[PDB]
Design a protein around this ligand. Structure first.
Ligand SMILES: CCCCCCCCCCCC[N+](C)(C)[O-]
Lengths: 84, 220, 73, 183, 183, 183, 183, 73
């Protein structure tokens, strides 16, 4: 049992952490860019649409280079537990 | 300001001897003390000439001189327990000299050691030396083989020795070497892996090892 | 027969977990980017494939399943 | 006075002082607080102090322990890291216990890390141990190796006397008299 | 007076004092509060104090326990970590029980952690135990080893008298007279 | 007066005082409230007090119980943790029960934690129990071990008299007269 | 005076000074703080100092350790990196232990890194070790190689005396007298 | 067989990427126009089809597969 209990908790936990940082950082960016309208309209994030569009691909690429390693470790762990 | 006043608080650690060469000689017991003394001179705390000496250094220096003027002399070691009258041990069997020749040797050694008043030459027995070595190895219960040559004896101690054995062997060898030196008797200590652990085998006149079922090894 | 079936379902359970993690994370990131209307299946599927080949899941499964019955040295 | 070394730790400085005093070099330790300790000697002794500092490769390093390579701040630890931390804690707890035996002054211990593979689909390998220790003067070393081996053998699930190496040594002569000051 | 050490805590300072007093070195302990304790000695004794600090490798380390590698603060932890904490608590509870027997002054215990494997697909190995203890002077050690073995045997599901190692020693002579002050 | 220790707890201070009085050392306890208790002695007794503090390793630890490793105040629990807490409470309830027997001053109990394996796929192992206790002077220890064994045997589903270890000891001589004050 | 080198660190400066003093060149070390140390010599000695700086390839670039290529502090790690760090920590801990043996002044150790294959599927391969060490003058090197081999053999799961290479050397003559100043 | 499957997944992985890109582009354009309440799939599936056929993806694909095993000439 305790192996099934462990792997289930570890799953819910990994979801909580891996979904944490992106939405916090996006909240901070969206806040500060909303606030500094209080001084200047700050076009240079959102006006160059081609640059905003590249930004998403850049973000996704970089992020995968930090998370895939984590998922690989988890996968090896669960397969080990399942078969050994 | 005498030199003895400069060596420290512990007086009896060192012994100061005047030499006919008009130089002070400082006798030390070991390397650590030797460097403790050399520092004082190299710093220049003393104004006249002085030199530091020890037993191993003097044995080496004298052997290097003997190599040149007496390249066939058989001997053991020079003891400096009393630095004013060293003792020189020569082989009784392997040497052949007259009394006059021995006296001449004595005088030339005395010229090499300006701090000594005379050198006593004593003849020792090789059979005694070899016997004390073998008796010591038996006393320690070490395994060994003995080989004899015209001018020397070699004891080979090799195998899968245990920690206890290594320690006791090391202590013994260190004790013997200090007495007789390393010229006549040599000890060779070697560690080797155990081929025989866990395998069935025949021993006797016709031994062999079963490396496994179906595989025979015949060492010879 | 019955005990075997049971033990098989058990294995399948563990195999699902990492992909479930992927499927959730990818949706949460798309919502963070506001592209709420896009179906995430179109992006999650290739990630799953990448993960499985980098993990080399076929070799591991084929080996370990045999190891449960054979003894190899 | 000439400056040899600066910004030392307390436990580096005391080791340098010890080594210089052993060779009859009188040295001075100075504290600058946030800047650490400084070591100074007289000019007549400068050359020697330099030669010994080189020969002993002073100042000494920090001491290394395997648990530093696998810090527990992890999202995931593999089997390998956990097993390593475990064994690296046992090694230290064994050394700390040996120092309580009668007459031992210091010791060091080593364990064969099988953990460099997971044994993944492989049968496990037996454990080997090494130990070094320093004794007070006048100790029957030969008779004391037995105690150590006996004690270590039962600290692990499977160990043979054949697989345990032990090396012992005696303390050197005590340095009690102070070095002489240059004239 | 020359400064040997700074920023010690209470249990480090009292050990340094004990060791120096044993060798006839009169030392002084000063408290600076948030800055900790400081140790000072006279110049005639400085050299010796340095040499002994080196020889014993003072100030002492903090004591290591395996439960420190696997903090119970962690939100999720594998069965290996839990099993380790469990064993690392039983060890300490045993040490604390032995210290209540008649005549024991201090003790140490070690247990074979089979968790170095999970024992997956394999039968669990038997337990091995090692213990050290110090007795009051005039104790029949030979007759007291039996009690310890008897007591330890039943603390685990499967232990053989053959697998229990016990090492005993007596307390050294008491240091009651104070050291002499330098002239 | 010289300071030995600061920031003690109540139950640490009283233990230290007891141990020093036993050796004829007059000590004084001072209370600083939030800063805890302080212990002081005269200079003529300082050396001895230091040596005894080292020999007994005062001040004592807190007392370890296995339940502390698996707090009920935690967001998750494996079954292993629950099972551990259960056993850790049974132990303490037995310790508290024995102290009500006639003559027993204090006691300690240990149980075989078979939970260090799940007992999955295998039949469970039998329980083993160990107990230590202290008696008043003039008690028939031999005739009292029977009672303890009888009592313990029925506290578990399957226990054999062979698997129960019991060790008894008597109280030491009473320390009633006060120590002498230094001249 | 002519400038040889600027912006040195403490260890590079002391190394250069040591090498120059050995050849009878009087040198001066100057501290500029944030700018580091500077080394200067007289004109009559400038030529020689240049030739030796070239011949020894001074200043020495700093010591390399394999863990520096796979720095532990990272967002990510992979089995190859973990295994490498592990071996590169065992190497350092062994060298630090050998320097505690009697007479050894410094030593260096090397291990066969099998990690350049994953050892996954492919069966793992036996270990090879090499050691260098320097001894104090008057040491029986022949009798001391045995101890080292014995100690190293048991540090690993599978090592044969045939696979261990050991090379020993003695310390050079001491440089105690100061060089002469140009006329 | 277990190696052939893995090779197949390796290949298909790299073919998924450009279509993903096209999906992101379409979605970002609909948002930048604020023409929000239209599902992008209806627009992007015609585009994917026309683009791949206009480049003869199937032909290049067939050649690239056969050239692992034969020379066509
Ligand atoms: C709506 C998201 C659902 C995520 C479900 C993830 C699988 C959870 C399986 C249960 C794990 C906890 N456990 C083993 C204690 O039951």
């Amino acid at each position: 049992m305790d192996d099934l209990v462990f792997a289930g908790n570890k799953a819910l936990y990994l979801v909580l952490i891996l979904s944490g940082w992106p939405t916090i950082v996006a909240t901070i960016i969206g806040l500060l860019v909303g606030l500094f309208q209080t001084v200047t309209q700050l076009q240079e994030q959102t006006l160059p649409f081609g640059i905003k569009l590249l930004g998403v691909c850049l973000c996704l690429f970089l992020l995968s280079g930090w998370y895939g390693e984590v998922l690989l470790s988890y996968g090896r762990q669960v397969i080990f537990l399942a078969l050994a | 300001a005498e030199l003895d006043s400069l060596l420290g608080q512990e007086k009896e650690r060192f012994q100061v001897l005047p030499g006919r060469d008009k130089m002070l000689y400082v006798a030390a017991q070991n390397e650590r003390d030797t460097l403790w003394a050399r520092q004082v001179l190299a710093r220049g705390d003393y104004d006249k000439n002085a030199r530091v000496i020890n037993e191993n250094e003097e044995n080496k220096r004298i052997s290097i001189w003997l190599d040149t003027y007496y390249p066939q002399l058989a001997y053991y070691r020079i003891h400096f327990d009393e630095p004013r009258k060293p003792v020189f041990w020569l082989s009784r069997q392997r040497n052949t000299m007259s009394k006059k020749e021995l006296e001449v040797l004595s005088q030339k050694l005395r010229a090499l050691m300006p701090y000594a008043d005379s050198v006593n030459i004593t003849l020792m027995d090789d059979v005694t030396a070899a016997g004390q070595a073998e008796a010591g190895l038996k006393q320690q219960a070490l395994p060994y083989s003995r080989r004899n040559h015209k001018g020397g004896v070699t004891f080979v101690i090799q195998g899968a020795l245990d920690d206890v054995e290594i320690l006791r062997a090391r202590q013994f060898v260190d004790s013997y070497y200090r007495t007789w030196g390393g010229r006549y008797v040599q000890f060779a200590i070697e560690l080797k892996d155990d081929w025989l652990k866990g395998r069935s085998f025949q021993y006797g006149a016709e031994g062999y090892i079963k490396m496994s079922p179906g595989h025979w090894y015949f060492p010879s | 027969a019955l005990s075997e079936i049971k033990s098989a379902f058990k294995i399948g359970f563990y195999l699902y977990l990492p992909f479930v993690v992927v499927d959730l994370v990818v949706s949460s990131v798309l919502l963070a980017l506001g592209m709420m209307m896009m179906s995430p299946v179109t992006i999650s599927t290739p990630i799953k494939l990448v993960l499985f080949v980098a993990l080399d899941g076929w070799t591991l499964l084929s080996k370990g399943l045999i190891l449960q019955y054979m003894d190899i040295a | 006075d000439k400056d040899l070394l600066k910004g030392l730790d307390q436990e580096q400085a005391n080791e340098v002082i010890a080594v210089l005093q052993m060779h009859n070099i009188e040295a001075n330790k100075i504290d600058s607080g946030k800047l650490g300790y400084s070591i100074t000697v007289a000019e007549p002794d400068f050359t020697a102090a330099v030669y010994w500092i080189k020969t002993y490769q002073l100042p000494p390093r920090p001491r290394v322990e395997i648990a530093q390579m696998f810090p527990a701040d992890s999202l995931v630890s593999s089997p390998r890291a956990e097993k390593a931390r475990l064994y690296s804690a046992i090694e230290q707890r064994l050394e700390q216990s040996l120092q309580t035996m009668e007459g031992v002054l210091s010791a060091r211990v080593h364990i064969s890390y099988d953990i460099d593979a997971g044994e993944n689909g492989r049968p496990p390998k037996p454990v080997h141990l090494s130990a070094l220790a320093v004794y007070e003067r006048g100790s029957p070393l030969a008779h004391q190796i037995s105690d150590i081996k006996r004690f270590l053998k039962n600290s692990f699930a499977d160990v043979d006397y054949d697989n345990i190496s032990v090396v012992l040594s005696e303390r050197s002569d005590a340095q009690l008299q102070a070095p002489g000051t240059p004239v």
